[PDB]
Each structure stands twice: as C-alpha cells, then as structure tokens.
Design a binder for this molecule. Structure first.
Ligand SMILES: [Zn+2]
Ligand SMILES: [Zn+2]
Ligand SMILES: [Zn+2]
Ligand SMILES: [Zn+2]
Ligand SMILES: [Zn+2]
Ligand SMILES: [Zn+2]
Lengths: 229, 198, 198, 198, 198, 229
C-alpha cells in the first residue's frame, strides 16, 4: 500500500559492518527478509514482533519503519532449551523452499518455541515438531512399504534414504519398537499425543539420524541446521 | 565493457560486509580518482595487518606481539577478567572509560547457524586464568545466544573460586520508557538499584 | 485543495502527532473509501472516550470509573507504588509481566527551565499514599528531566517511612556494548549485580 | 489493557492504514493529554466529512456539491479529461501546477485475477463525457494494473473521436541512472524526446 | 591498547565513503579472521587497478588501454554519443540492455561546492567528437546540477550539426502516482507520449 | 517526541557509496543534517521539503522517515540562475556558525532563491541577499569610519579587511559612487529597495571582492563558496 504491517518471529539477525540490522522473519504469511538501518534492537532471535515494512522499487530487501515487541520468551536465554530453537528456526528455514507457507506452519513453529521454552524436555519437543513440520511441507516419509522392494511394514533402518527397509533389503538390525512406532505415526498424530509418549534418550540419536538422512536426500540445500543436532 | 579489473574490484569490495553492489561500484570509481600513494598505503596497510595482527595466546584479544597490550600492561587490575564475544567489545568496553581489568575473548556467540559450541569458542583457555580472589565479569551479548553463553560460562567457572558477575540488563542511556522494549523494562525494574536505604 | 470538507479533515488529522500534511491527505483519501459504519464508530470511539475518559483520583492512571482498575483490583500488591511520567508507561510496565503493584502518574516531568514545577505534576496526591512498610519505585524517564524528577521525588518521599528505589539504568536487552552509549555502559558497569559471592 | 474505552480506541485507531497497535496506543495516550475542544473538532470533522462527502456524479472526484469544483470551474480547459485511479491522484496532478483540465476517477484499477472488471470501476460514466476535438490523458498507475487499465481504456475510448494519450513512463526527477530500475531506463530511452532536429 | 595497526586500519577504512567508525571497526575485525591469500589478493587487486585503470583519452570512460572498450568495439553505433556525469552511469546505461552507442564522461556535476565549471569537466574533448548525422544524448542527472549541465551542453553543441536529445524526465518504473513527486508527475505528463493517433 | 516534523530547503545532498542520501537542510529553526537510507529522491537541491526525522540515541545524524515535496523551482535547472543559489546555499551555510538562526534568516534565504529563480538579474539578487544576510548574522561591515584611523565617511577600498579606508590610509583610488552607496546602505535598507537600484555589471566584481575579504577576515572557515563567485 506499499508499506505493510507484518507480524512474525525473528529466526535470524545480522548486525552488519555499517551498523544495520538485517533480519529474517517467519510469519503466518511467512518468508520475510528485511533491514532496519541503525532503538529497534528488540529485533532479537525468537522474539515475536510486529513490523512496518516499506518494500519500494523492487529492492530485494524490504526495510523496517517501526518494530514492536509483541511477545518474548526470556526462558530461551537458558543453554539446553536455547539449543532447541536454532535447530527449530534453522530447520524450518531449510525445510521450506520459499513459495510454501501458510499459517499452519507458522502456528506449529511458534508452538515448538513455547514448547522448548516451558517444557521439561526441550529435545523431545524439537524432535516431535521437526517431524511434524515434515507433514506441513509435504515431505512425508513413506513408512508403509520397504523403500527398496515395496514389502509392507519395514522395521529396519535405511542408511541411503532415511526411510525404512524390510529384513531382506536391510543389512542393519531392526529399529527398537519405540523408534518404529514414532517413525510410523509421529507425522500424523497430535503434538500433544507425542509429548505424552516420549522416546528414551538412548534411542533418540537414531531418530535424529533418520531425520537428517531423509531431509538431505529429499530437500535441496546445504543443510547447515545439522550443526544443530 | 568487461575489464575483469573493474568487475574484479566490485566483486571483492562487495565480498565485504556492509557494502552492496551499488555501493561497491560507487567505491571502485572513487578509488580510480585517488593517487597512487594512497592506494598503496591502503593495500600495504591491509597486508600488513593481516600479518602483524594474530590472536593473543592468553586472552584472545587481537595484537601483533607475544601478549596483548592488555595482558602486558602492569597497571591493569590483574584480578578481574571480562569475558566477551568479540574483540570489538574490548574496544567498546575500553573506550568506555570505566574498566582497567583483563579481558577474554570467546571468538563468537554460542550457536548460530550450527553448533559454535564451547569447543568452537575460546572457553578452555579461560579456565586456567580464573582463580580465587578474582572476578569474572560476563559481558557476552544479550541475545538468547549471549544469555546462553554466559549461563554456560557461569556454570563452568563456578567450581573455581572466583566471583562471577554479569553486566546489567537495563534501559540504555538517553532513552525514555515509552520506547523501551517490554522485557528490558522488566529487567531494569527487577534489577533496580537502591539509592538510599531509610 | 477545494472541497472545504477535505481541507478541513487534512488539517485536523495533521494536527495529530506522527502525521504530517502528506500523510494526512493520504489518510483522508482512505477514509473516503470506507463505509460509513466505521467512520461513525471511529468518531464515537473518540467521543465516548473524550467523555468517559478521566484521570483516577487516587493514582492518576486513566480510567472511566471511581478508581482505576489497578486501584480497585484486590489481588494487586497494595504495598508498592511505581511512580511514572505517563499513563502509557503504566501499560509498558504492565505488559512487562513482572509487576503487580500500584502505580502513580505525575502527568509529566519536572523542568526548572519552563517554570514547570511539582505543582504542574501530580506530586501532591502521592505523598498521602506513601506510608511505612511500603516501597516507592521511581520509574520516571532517564533524560535529565526524568533523572531530575526522580531525585526530587526521592527527597520529598524521604521523610515518610518508605523504601525508595529507582529503576536500573543499564544496557537494553538485545544489544552489544559496541553500539551502547558511553554513559549507559558506565552505569551498567557501576550498577553491576553480583551473580555469585565466593 | 483494562479500561474498555482505551481498549476500544486502540482498536479503532489501529484499524487505520499506516498505524499499528504500538502506534495506536501511542496515539490514544496523546488524545488523553488533549483538551476536549479538539477531540470534538476531530470527531465532527470526521462525521461532517462522512456526511458531506460524496462522489461527483460527472467525474467521480470527491466533493460536497452537485458537481465537483473542477467540473464547476469555468476557467478549466473543458476539452481534456485526465483519467485517474484515485481522488488522491487528482490532488497530486493538481498541486503539480501544470494541468487545468477535467479529471475522471475510476475508483480503482482493473485486475482480471479478482474478477474486478470495468463494472467495479467508474469506466461507464466516462464514455459519454468523451467526444471529438478532445483529449483523454490516461494517468492510471504503472503497475501491471495501471498499465492494464489504461490499455483497456484506450481500446474502449478509441471508437469515440478523441485523442488518447498516456503519461510518460520515465526516470523520476532528481535521480541518477545508477539507481533507476532497468525497465524504467528502457522506457525513458525508447520514449526519448528530441530536443533538436538538425 | 593503541596499536597504530588496528587504529590505522579503522581510520583508512572509515576514510572511505559509506562506512562509518562503527562499521570500519566491524570491518577490521573481519579482515583479522581472514587468511592471508585473500588479504593479499585484496591489496594487490587494489594496487593494481589503481595502475591499469586511467581515463580514456577520447571519451573519458575508465579503462586500462589506449582507448576504452566502448571506443574500440567496432560493432558499437559510432553515430550516437551519450554524455554522462560519471563512469558509473556508463555501467548503469550499459547494463540497461538498450544502448550500443558511444559514451562521454564529464567527470562530475556542474557546480557543487564551488565552481566545477566547463573547464573542471571534460566538456572540451567532446566538441571535436560531435559532427553531423550524429546524435548527442544528454544523460546528466536531474538535479539542478544535471539540468544545468545539460542545458549548457545543449547550447555548446548546438553550432555543430548534430541532433541533441535529453533523457526522459518521468515517473520511474514500478511506482504509482501517489508516491511520485509533484514536479516529476508534471514532467511525465507534459512529456506524455502518444500511443495512438486517430 | 522523539521523532519530529521539520520543514526546510535542501542546500546539500550526498549519495554515498552504500546508496544512502545524506542531506543538509536550512530550516526556520534551521541547521539540520539527516540521512535517508535508500522513493525519497525528491530530496534534491533547493527543493522546499517537509520531513519526519527520528534522532535517536545521540547518533550525530538524524534519519528520514518520510519526505514531502512542498515546493520546487524548476527554473533553477537553468545555468546562470543556478549559479546563484550554490553561492547562496554555500554562502549561508558558511556564514552561520550553527548556534545562530531564527526564522528571519530562513525567510531571507528562501526569498533569495525565488529571486534567483524568477528575476531577470540573478547575480544582482545574490549580491543583495548575501550582504543582507550579513545583517541577520550580526557581522555588519563598519562603514561610517575609516577602518584604520577612524575618520568619518571613507570612500576607498580596504584590501586587508574588506571595509573602507579614508584617503590618507588608502593606497587605492576611491570606489565609484554606486559602489559606495551600496556598501554604505545595502545591509540596512529593503531588499525591494535594492533590487530597484542595481549596480552596473562593470562595478560588481569590486562588490564581490569586498564581500569575500570581509567574510574571510570576520568568520572562521574554509570559505569554499568563493568558488561560487
Ligand atoms: Zn525390501
Ligand atoms: Zn591478552
Ligand atoms: Zn488508580
Ligand atoms: Zn466532477
Ligand atoms: Zn573511450
Ligand atoms: Zn584613515
């Protein structure tokens, strides 16, 4: 109009050599890069924020003209919990290729950050929310059939594609039942439901590894959020 | 037109932070109008520095010697260490005319796009520097990163016998509450200092 | 500009803060595209407000009742009074999720220059509200005005038996020392909080 | 936020373009400090306007009479009609000190995407106004919308015997090619004016 | 701390346009983290360019040869000369994909803080380049400076038998009249192009 | 408040390497440097303009958040006339040391620009307005008494101080009566009155020279506006 009001969460911040602040925001209408020349340094990571942006003559970068602080989470200043939004923010940014992106993905992302902020087990939240986000991106792991031959109900890891192989195609022992159950039903069933059914910290690395393999095989990019795991 | 020379300068200048394509060109055409003595002095100065400057072995503040000027200087309060994210903060807290202690530079902020972790940051070489009858001022940022790094540092340094402190979260100088962020105000309030007891 | 109605709207709108001539016009031509239900609701909201809105007799926070919602509310800590410059600060310190006490609104800041003294500000009605076993948090600005008002308030309230405190001058949340004003840093430093005592 | 009157004002104000929540509040607390004569005059100005303001029957420029001041005025060149998207453009092209003709306001721009066609815009009442020995300047925007509306208007007006013209796509005043969009330059070039013919 | 080396880099970087003290430091601490191969390539590239680059003797476009690539190139329309203020405009009007003629660079804008005049600008070497059956496009800025330089150039070139033209003052691409300056609109209007005669 | 609305005339513009626009404005409350990061390129020389400026944390440079175009003079795009606002703008900026500066100086400056815009003789306007501005700066040439010995009614040039010497202190012939008359009464009498009494172009260089000598002797600075004469 052609300034606009937008609301969202700060997922990245740069403070440039000049002294500007370039920020990426995840928004309900999401996908927003913008720069606040030079007061407005409440544009810190994971702050929910309202902004007035002027785009202008097709500048590749909109610019900030007012920023609010609609909602913060001071709890996120803690180390273990903090270690589950970077991966959450960096994960979400990598997962969605830029056209993609309603309001559903945004509500789920915001939820994941309250989750890692207030909940005893931030890692478990981050795991569940990450696989849940896979649904809203339309990149769902096929779990019903062996990734190689098609056989129903595969139980074994798939080192090449992140999915599952049957016992004939597999060279590795079967996943533990808690891992299989999660893999099979996590994307589909409620976030609440999954928080109620955690997975032993011992079996979680296998869950992270499958997510990494799956996502790097399926989505293009230099998936730098894995430094996040 | 295609002189890899002008095209080459624009690129390298633009590879620099804060300086976009339009500004790089603006910059190349200014370097053109300059005499030769200066261009050389800009280039030599560059080469140079890159050579004389390295990280200090004790604290990791930038220098060109065996120890940083701060480490060397004998009039500096040898009992307080101010942990910081970047060498630029040392200048900021130095040109602040209120601190004559020692500094320590973790080279970054915990986690940004990947696990910069306490092994990607100079956190190890700090431990041995911390003893009793000493104070460790935590002057990392205030982003969830700085907040997180600090609490990690607090935990770590705890077992050693030093006093650990964090810089004051608070309203900045020259502002009015109306334009001050909510979380700041709440911190400037809960962290209020008593100016007079009855 | 011809239709006096349009010239009249531009004027009145432009009389508002943060809205210049160019923006007033921009605004009049937007009001034109709107359906009458809104214009009325905007007008009424303004008037309802101008009529229903008055200053609280106890503290001078804005309301439409006998006492402000803060004064009324019984779950609010009746022992702490947060003196503030403007009703907007009450919101700011309220949406800050860290204070459930009472507020007090001097409708401004002192300023010796313009003969504006503690008689042009609601400083009198505060005294009687202050007793012992109470705390008076001074949350006026940090300009020489806010700084001055506060010290004046401190002096005044002193004889009464309450604890007087001032909000923390300090670095704002989400900043790095490099871009923080000098006088702020010196205050964030001298006002440093000890996080651990050996 | 408690006093519903304040919550009510913030809402209605925030419903205005170029004014977000933070700014609405900033605005409500300023209206509070004001004397009632103004609030009323603002309210009345709004209402007077909402009542007195209507679209001109001939051209659809905003007024409070039978015909707009432009239509009425007899010294205005009765032979040129400047078609525009919004009444604000009439001011812009009026405060431009270079046009004394008649205007016409399509209250918008075409947009095939949203079924918005020449029936949602005042394109009909224009046809009868166009005759021969007249000129129709197309001053719609330059977005694909303005570009499209204009070409539609050109097609439509063609059968009538008037000269149709479009405003000049070109570099804006006070700029240098370096910061001028590519497509603009190409238009400022192909549309170059000859200042001298040998 | 006082290494003339860091203090020296900040200065020289900051002596550069668009880059203030805070940004220079930000820049020095980034150069520190860089390997040596790059610093050298930045410094050599600098030295260099300064050497290979000089002004073209014919037109004064920047190059490293006897004639600029534009002057040399044989496929370029040898009959049109585009006068410009700065070598950067040559790029701008070159990356514009709509002009294959010759350029001419007055090195600046007539008068800024003192009489840059037609003797401080390469206006002389242009005259001999202008002949008949040629066109001189005046592409100087649009400030009173560019406007003035151009009219001066027009006067001067007149006696020679070439067609003189000025680039189109007009609305920029990707804008709407509402946010377009008044004087621009008046020019985009008076300079309107006819898209169809009846 | 702490953004403010200000109105004034653009006397200088920079377009930086970054692509910003730093401008100096002369305003009724005058003396204003500001920067518009990156639309708002109607901030060209000699445009009368309304701006919304946010100062902020004592940044040495306020910043633009909206600019209007209140009034331009397209006539100033002409060469001879143009050559009389630079000197006017550059002259005014040099003449006033920065505290100084009401509304009177601003009205006179704006007047001088309409003058050089619409009037047949821009040089004469620039001369008159420059000496008139000397009054509003409180730097008035003493004209009643020889600059060296004090003798009433000096007629001769003063090469060292820009004022006037008597015949005993002078080594140069007396000024022509038109020049003397201007020198003696221009600062005091109406701008209208002086436009009605021009000075022959032949005698004007002497008038410019006295102004230069006077102003460089009396006011500090690297008076770069003399490139303006
Ligand atoms: Zn299989
Ligand atoms: Zn050291
Ligand atoms: Zn109350
Ligand atoms: Zn009409
Ligand atoms: Zn050449
Ligand atoms: Zn004498």
């Amino acid at each position: 109009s052609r300034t606009a009001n937008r609301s969202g969460i700060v997922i990245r911040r740069r403070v440039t050599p000049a002294g500007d602040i370039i920020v990426t925001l995840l928004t309900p209408q999401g996908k927003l890069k913008a720069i606040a020349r030079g007061l407005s340094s409440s544009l810190n990571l994971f702050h929910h924020v309202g902004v007035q942006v002027y785009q202008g003559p097709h500048n590749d970068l909109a610019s900030v003209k007012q920023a609010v602080l609609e909602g913060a989470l001071p709890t996120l200043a803690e180390p273990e919990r903090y270690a589950f939004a970077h991966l959450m923010a960096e994960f979400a940014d990598a997962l969605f290729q830029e056209g993609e992106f309603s309001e559903q993905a945004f509500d789920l992302f915001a939820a994941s950050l309250r989750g890692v902020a207030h909940q005893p087990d931030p890692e478990w939240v981050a795991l569940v929310m990450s696989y849940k986000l896979l649904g809203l991106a339309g990149v769902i792991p096929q779990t019903a059939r062996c990734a190689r031959c098609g056989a129903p109900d595969p139980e074994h890891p798939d080192p090449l594609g992140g999915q599952l192989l049957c016992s004939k195609c597999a060279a590795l022992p079967p996943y533990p039942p808690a891992v299989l159950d999660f893999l099979r039903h996590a994307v589909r069933r409620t976030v609440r439901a999954s928080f109620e059914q955690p997975v032993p910290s011992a079996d979680r690395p296998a869950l992270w590894r499958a997510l990494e393999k799956f996502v790097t095989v399926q989505v293009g990019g230099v998936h730098s959020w894995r430094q996040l795991v | 037109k295609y002189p890899p020379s002008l095209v080459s300068l624009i690129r390298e200048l633009s590879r620099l932070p804060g300086i976009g394509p339009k500004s790089a060109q603006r910059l190349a055409f200014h370097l053109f109008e300059q005499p030769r003595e200066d261009i050389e002095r800009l280039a030599s100065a560059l080469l140079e520095a890159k050579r004389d400057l390295h990280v200090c072995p004790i604290c990791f503040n930038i220098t060109d010697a065996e120890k940083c000027d701060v480490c060397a200087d004998p009039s500096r309060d040898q009992r307080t260490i101010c942990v910081v994210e970047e060498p630029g903060d040392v200048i900021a807290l130095e040109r602040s005319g209120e601190y004559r202690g020692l500094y320590h530079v973790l080279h970054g902020v915990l986690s940004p796009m990947n696990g910069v972790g306490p092994d990607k940051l100079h956190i190890k070489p700090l431990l041995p520097r911390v003893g009793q009858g000493m104070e460790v001022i935590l002057a990392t940022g205030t982003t969830v990163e700085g907040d997180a790094t600090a609490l990690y540092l607090q935990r770590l340094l705890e077992p050693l016998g030093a006093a650990i402190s964090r810089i004051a979260y608070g309203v900045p100088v020259g502002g009015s509450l109306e334009y001050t962020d909510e979380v700041t105000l709440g911190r400037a309030l809960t962290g209020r200092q008593t100016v007079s007891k009855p």
